[PDB]
């Protein structure tokens, strides 16, 4: 199952990468769902080929620290998640990301000095990986 789109449904919980049988998962679209907790704790490497993960307009609370394991993301749309507060440092390893929409995202971590360029956000998090004072 390469691509899957289930946008604008009423999805409560998507399962973690251990429940899915496929191995070529390359695009997941789940915008406009009632999703609370993105689960990536167990065997997050199975989604290592994902190249698009949209979760906009959900009830996401916190991006898991294991999100850095999805080393091949090119887009990640976690926009319009009001309850979302700050990005984890470990996200800085997604070196192939080129799109990271931040519209209507009241972030605790200040990137007003950075701006909106996604690569800058990623490099900033990558530097905060080494040391943060």
XYZ file of N, CA and C in Angstrom:
399
model
N 0.857 -1.179 0.000
C 0.000 0.000 0.000
C 0.896 1.232 0.000
N 1.191 1.747 -1.190
C 2.071 2.902 -1.296
C 1.420 4.149 -0.726
N 0.297 4.560 -1.292
C -0.376 5.782 -0.890
C -1.712 5.476 -0.232
N -2.114 6.347 0.692
C -3.408 6.233 1.350
C -3.880 7.619 1.755
N -5.142 7.924 1.472
C -5.744 9.207 1.805
C -7.081 8.929 2.471
N -7.255 9.414 3.696
C -8.535 9.307 4.381
C -8.877 10.629 5.036
N -8.658 11.716 4.306
C -8.907 13.052 4.807
C -10.395 13.278 5.039
N -10.690 14.257 5.897
C -12.050 14.744 6.162
C -13.015 13.631 6.546
N -12.490 12.549 7.091
C -13.296 11.553 7.769
C -13.416 11.947 9.237
N -13.865 11.022 10.076
C -13.830 11.201 11.524
C -12.994 10.060 12.087
N -11.676 10.229 12.073
C -10.741 9.189 12.487
C -10.288 9.485 13.904
N -10.444 8.512 14.794
C -10.125 8.732 16.196
C -8.662 8.439 16.503
N -8.140 7.316 16.019
C -6.789 6.901 16.373
C -6.143 6.210 15.186
N -5.047 6.780 14.676
C -4.436 5.909 13.680
C -3.418 4.996 14.345
N -3.331 3.749 13.913
C -2.402 2.815 14.546
C -0.957 3.175 14.259
N -0.076 2.654 15.103
C 1.337 2.853 14.928
C 1.865 1.998 13.801
N 3.110 2.248 13.395
C 3.694 1.502 12.271
C 3.809 0.004 12.490
N 3.520 -0.505 13.684
C 3.606 -1.942 13.898
C 2.358 -2.654 13.404
N 1.218 -1.962 13.391
C -0.036 -2.594 12.999
C -0.187 -2.706 11.487
N 0.464 -1.834 10.733
C 0.324 -1.832 9.287
C 1.215 -2.904 8.675
N 0.653 -3.678 7.742
C 1.382 -4.778 7.117
C 2.300 -4.341 5.991
N 2.014 -3.218 5.342
C 2.787 -2.829 4.177
C 4.226 -2.497 4.551
N 5.054 -2.358 3.520
C 6.423 -1.908 3.685
C 6.791 -0.754 2.772
N 5.967 -0.433 1.777
C 6.243 0.655 0.853
C 5.355 1.862 1.113
N 4.904 2.036 2.355
C 4.122 3.205 2.729
C 4.889 4.473 2.393
N 4.371 5.257 1.458
C 5.098 6.398 0.946
C 4.321 7.699 0.970
N 3.035 7.680 1.293
C 2.270 8.915 1.411
C 1.038 8.611 2.237
N 0.889 9.303 3.358
C -0.260 9.154 4.234
C -0.921 10.511 4.391
N -2.221 10.563 4.139
C -3.000 11.788 4.220
C -4.126 11.559 5.210
N -4.131 12.321 6.294
C -5.176 12.170 7.295
C -5.612 13.512 7.843
N -5.531 14.557 7.030
C -5.959 15.876 7.453
C -7.449 15.888 7.774
N -7.837 16.851 8.612
C -9.228 17.071 9.001
C -9.832 15.823 9.637
N -9.111 15.262 10.593
C -9.601 14.145 11.374
C -9.519 14.508 12.846
N -10.233 13.745 13.667
C -10.192 13.927 15.116
C -9.112 13.039 15.736
N -7.866 13.302 15.355
C -6.724 12.513 15.802
C -6.042 13.244 16.945
N -5.787 12.528 18.039
C -5.210 13.120 19.240
C -3.716 12.849 19.378
N -3.316 11.581 19.387
C -1.947 11.191 19.705
C -1.394 10.381 18.546
N -0.486 10.979 17.782
C 0.257 10.234 16.777
C 1.191 9.257 17.480
N 1.029 7.968 17.208
C 1.776 6.928 17.902
C 2.928 6.466 17.021
N 4.150 6.565 17.547
C 5.325 6.092 16.826
C 6.324 5.399 17.743
N 5.879 4.877 18.886
C 6.816 4.356 19.875
C 7.461 3.058 19.409
N 6.657 2.117 18.931
C 7.122 0.772 18.617
C 7.391 0.656 17.124
N 8.623 0.271 16.780
C 9.016 -0.064 15.411
C 8.725 1.077 14.439
N 9.168 2.278 14.804
C 8.956 3.437 13.950
C 9.780 3.398 12.675
N 10.695 2.444 12.537
C 11.509 2.346 11.334
C 10.751 1.745 10.165
N 9.598 1.121 10.412
C 8.824 0.538 9.323
C 8.314 1.611 8.372
N 8.115 2.828 8.870
C 7.719 3.957 8.046
C 8.904 4.749 7.514
N 10.088 4.140 7.428
C 11.284 4.864 7.008
C 11.214 5.381 5.580
N 10.252 4.930 4.787
C 10.130 5.352 3.402
C 9.045 6.394 3.194
N 8.330 6.786 4.253
C 7.247 7.751 4.117
C 7.795 9.057 3.572
N 7.165 9.566 2.516
C 7.605 10.796 1.884
C 6.590 11.918 1.986
N 5.464 11.697 2.657
C 4.479 12.751 2.877
C 3.565 12.298 3.998
N 3.497 13.076 5.072
C 2.639 12.772 6.212
C 1.887 14.036 6.586
N 0.601 14.073 6.278
C -0.233 15.226 6.565
C -1.105 14.914 7.765
N -1.127 15.825 8.730
C -1.981 15.660 9.894
C -2.628 16.976 10.286
N -2.802 17.880 9.327
C -3.363 19.185 9.620
C -4.803 19.064 10.098
N -5.229 20.077 10.852
C -6.603 20.208 11.331
C -7.026 19.012 12.175
N -6.139 18.568 13.046
C -6.444 17.526 14.013
C -6.294 18.084 15.424
N -6.430 17.199 16.405
C -6.231 17.538 17.809
C -4.892 17.028 18.318
N -3.850 17.092 17.487
C -2.529 16.625 17.893
C -2.019 17.424 19.085
N -1.406 16.725 20.037
C -0.908 17.345 21.258
C 0.600 17.559 21.239
N 1.365 16.557 20.813
C 2.818 16.665 20.827
C 3.401 15.725 19.788
N 4.256 16.261 18.923
C 4.982 15.418 17.969
C 5.916 14.494 18.736
N 5.863 13.184 18.510
C 6.687 12.272 19.293
C 8.157 12.529 19.055
N 9.003 12.291 20.059
C 10.449 12.446 19.852
C 11.030 11.437 18.883
N 10.332 10.341 18.606
C 10.811 9.354 17.650
C 10.559 9.751 16.202
N 9.961 10.921 15.950
C 9.667 11.357 14.588
C 10.927 11.464 13.743
N 12.088 11.651 14.370
C 13.334 11.699 13.633
C 13.701 10.398 12.957
N 13.023 9.303 13.302
C 13.328 8.015 12.698
C 12.791 7.924 11.275
N 11.746 8.690 10.959
C 11.195 8.751 9.611
C 12.113 9.566 8.716
N 13.306 9.039 8.455
C 14.419 9.775 7.873
C 14.194 10.209 6.437
N 13.046 9.920 5.827
C 12.839 10.233 4.418
C 11.658 11.164 4.180
N 11.163 11.833 5.217
C 10.065 12.774 5.036
C 10.481 13.923 4.133
N 9.594 14.288 3.214
C 9.768 15.483 2.409
C 8.725 16.544 2.687
N 7.603 16.175 3.283
C 6.610 17.130 3.736
C 6.002 16.616 5.025
N 5.702 17.531 5.941
C 5.022 17.174 7.183
C 4.106 18.329 7.544
N 2.804 18.115 7.441
C 1.820 19.181 7.586
C 1.096 18.977 8.909
N 1.610 19.612 9.958
C 0.990 19.538 11.274
C 0.353 20.878 11.592
N -0.016 21.621 10.555
C -0.613 22.930 10.735
C -1.990 22.812 11.389
N -2.527 23.967 11.791
C -3.852 24.093 12.413
C -4.071 23.086 13.539
N -3.026 22.843 14.315
C -3.110 22.067 15.547
C -2.881 23.033 16.706
N -3.973 23.642 17.178
C -3.876 24.667 18.213
C -3.263 24.115 19.492
N -3.663 22.906 19.891
C -3.119 22.297 21.098
C -1.630 21.990 20.985
N -1.100 21.855 19.769
C 0.331 21.645 19.590
C 1.101 22.875 20.052
N 2.173 22.653 20.811
C 2.906 23.737 21.450
C 4.305 23.914 20.873
N 5.126 22.869 20.862
C 6.512 23.032 20.453
C 6.998 21.780 19.741
N 7.957 21.971 18.840
C 8.549 20.859 18.117
C 9.656 20.222 18.947
N 9.746 18.899 18.956
C 10.863 18.243 19.632
C 12.156 18.455 18.873
N 13.261 18.448 19.621
C 14.577 18.651 19.024
C 14.879 17.585 17.985
N 14.528 16.328 18.281
C 14.888 15.192 17.437
C 14.387 15.320 16.002
N 13.420 16.205 15.747
C 12.938 16.462 14.395
C 14.044 16.969 13.478
N 15.133 17.494 14.034
C 16.176 18.099 13.230
C 16.923 17.144 12.323
N 16.694 15.837 12.447
C 17.380 14.864 11.609
C 16.665 14.608 10.291
N 15.447 15.124 10.118
C 14.694 14.974 8.871
C 15.269 15.932 7.829
N 16.494 15.626 7.406
C 17.251 16.514 6.534
C 16.634 16.672 5.151
N 15.741 15.775 4.745
C 15.156 15.831 3.412
C 13.849 16.606 3.367
N 13.380 17.129 4.498
C 12.154 17.914 4.506
C 12.384 19.218 3.761
N 11.437 19.582 2.899
C 11.464 20.871 2.233
C 10.167 21.646 2.387
N 9.147 21.062 3.009
C 7.889 21.746 3.262
C 7.465 21.465 4.693
N 7.139 22.522 5.430
C 6.742 22.408 6.834
C 5.816 23.567 7.159
N 4.546 23.470 6.761
C 3.614 24.577 6.998
C 3.389 24.821 8.481
N 3.339 26.105 8.849
C 3.207 26.516 10.242
C 2.047 27.484 10.440
N 1.093 27.506 9.514
C -0.005 28.458 9.581
C -0.885 28.194 10.797
N -1.257 29.276 11.489
C -2.148 29.238 12.656
C -1.641 28.270 13.720
N -0.329 28.262 13.913
C 0.335 27.354 14.843
C 0.981 28.189 15.943
N 0.272 28.350 17.060
C 0.765 29.148 18.175
C 1.866 28.384 18.893
N 3.103 28.561 18.440
C 4.225 27.784 18.937
C 4.844 28.418 20.175
N 5.171 27.572 21.151
C 5.917 28.026 22.320
C 7.350 28.362 21.929
N 8.047 27.407 21.315
C 9.394 27.656 20.818
C 9.360 28.754 19.767
N 10.132 29.809 19.997
C 10.091 30.978 19.132
C 10.986 30.759 17.921
N 10.388 30.822 16.733
C 11.128 30.872 15.480
C 10.813 32.144 14.706
N 10.238 33.145 15.384
C 9.982 34.434 14.751
C 11.264 35.065 14.227
N 12.403 34.752 14.848
C 13.685 35.199 14.325
C 14.121 34.364 13.127
N 13.711 33.097 13.071
C 14.052 32.249 11.935
C 13.205 32.612 10.723
N 11.890 32.668 10.905
C 10.986 32.938 9.807
C 10.113 31.747 9.475
N 9.967 31.445 8.185
C 9.098 30.369 7.741
C 9.797 29.322 6.889
N 11.054 29.539 6.508
C 11.785 28.567 5.705
C 11.951 27.262 6.472
N 11.503 26.160 5.866
C 11.498 24.878 6.561
C 12.911 24.372 6.816
N 13.793 24.510 5.824
C 15.168 24.048 5.979
C 15.859 24.763 7.132
N 15.542 26.044 7.335
C 16.117 26.775 8.456
C 15.638 26.210 9.787
N 14.343 25.899 9.890
C 13.799 25.268 11.091
C 14.525 23.960 11.376
N 14.717 23.152 10.335
C 15.331 21.842 10.513
C 16.780 21.988 10.948
N 17.524 22.893 10.310
C 18.918 23.102 10.688
C 19.029 23.642 12.107
N 18.115 24.536 12.492
C 18.090 25.061 13.851
C 17.908 23.942 14.866
N 16.916 23.080 14.641
C 16.719 21.938 15.526
C 17.940 21.024 15.521
N 18.594 20.890 14.366
C 19.778 20.044 14.276
C 20.910 20.594 15.127
N 21.047 21.919 15.175
C 22.066 22.513 16.034
C 21.681 22.383 17.499
N 20.390 22.509 17.809
C 19.959 22.323 19.186
C 20.105 20.882 19.647
N 20.237 19.937 18.715
C 20.558 18.559 19.088
C 21.894 18.471 19.811
N 22.926 19.127 19.272
C 24.267 19.025 19.842
C 24.307 19.558 21.268
N 23.747 20.744 21.489
C 23.827 21.400 22.785
C 22.797 22.516 22.827
N 22.205 22.724 24.001
C 21.235 23.792 24.203
C 21.467 24.409 25.571
N 21.702 25.715 25.599
C 21.952 26.425 26.848
C 20.848 27.451 27.051
